[model samples]
Target: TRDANGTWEMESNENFEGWMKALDIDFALRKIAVRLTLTLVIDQDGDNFKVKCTSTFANYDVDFTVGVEFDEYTKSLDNRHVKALVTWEGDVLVCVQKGEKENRGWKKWIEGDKLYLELTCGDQVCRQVFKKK
Candidate 1:
């Protein structure tokens, strides 16, 4: 049973380079991100949560409560700032990022044995599948 006050661990196995490519991240940054192991530390509260992605070279942290809005900085992805909010779509977590590009941000879903993440920037959308271990 999942509750509001719990921690979940997530890993990203997608081609970091591919995500960078889709976002048009700089070559040097892509080089670093490709070799980087991205780890997400998630803490869920009642309608609110804090997610932190940390790697050897950089760390990204943000917090949002459902129905509340916040500014997001994709430090590696062109450094474009956006207003972000996350909500639940069925059992999946859906995040909408409003900014310079259309259909941006990400959606997270889970299947029988794996987790899926869909990231969008401009017209480029990248999908990443992960296993819960």
Candidate 2:
């Protein structure tokens, strides 16, 4: 199983701007987001988990339990409302967000000492890599 309960510092991002555009994020925010090194703090216990994403411009916090759906507001990210559910596909943490956009979701996996995050919205997918810190 993937042990994802630690702090991860962003190393690289691919197609992040495209993914942000798909979410209709503002141009100013996207500019700042692309230049920022985001940090992820994950706390996992049993089937429940807490994730805190921090950057120079903003911070997003989420708490959820596996297999249970909950209402989530994107806050600073996109300012959208979504019904989010977390599930496990093998060792990966898969999240599906049902709302105004189609094919919107994210998946997280750990490989070696790196954490990989794949973000999707519409037809755009962004890949981000983070190193354990």
Candidate 3:
């Protein structure tokens, strides 16, 4: 699967402000969060996989199996507890996070020389592209 298996560094983001607002992020945190560069490390072995996202400000790591639901604590981001499930929809790895927020989840896919991430909360969507190095 050539979807999201590799090391990638963040390149750019669009509509990130609205997405952060929808998450109810603190004004003070939002200021710093917007300036941080994020990196993703993904490893997949059949149905089991581990994903790790890091930044100069904070980091989040999690392990999950396809078709399985697990409790996830979004520590560095919102400090919210959510039940998360990861599944592949065609060429994209889609995560559906169930918690206090609606329409919360993320999508990851490979496009050309870059990896694309789409974060969603409520009606807001944040598009972040990362270069595969």
| Clash count of each predicted structure | 0, 0, 0
Candidate 3 off by > 4 Å: 1-3
Which regions of candidate 2 fall more than 4 Å away from where they truly are? none
TM-score of 3: 0.91
Instruction: List model 2 lDDT by residue over 32-74, tens digit each.
Output: 8888878999998989899999987698999999999999999
Model 2 alpha-carbon miss at residue 53, Å: 0.6
Candidate 1 C-alpha lDDT tens digits along 1-133? 1233322234455555666676667888877776766666667777878877677888888789877788888774578888998888777788898987778778877665466778876666676665544
Runs in model 1 lying further than 4 Å from the true structure: 1-12, 111-114
Residue 38 shift from truth in candidate 2, angstroms: 0.9
- Model 1 scores a TM of 0.79
Predicted structure 3: lDDT = 0.88
Candidate whose lDDT is highest: 2
Worst 10 residues of 3 by lDDT: 1-10
Kindly report the root-mean-square deviation of model 3 from the true structure over all alpha carbons. Answer: 1.4
lDDT of 3 by residue, 1-133 (tens): 4556788888899999899899888888889888988788988888788889888877888999988999999887788999999888887889999999999999988887788889999999999998877
lDDT agreement with native, every candidate: 0.70, 0.92, 0.88
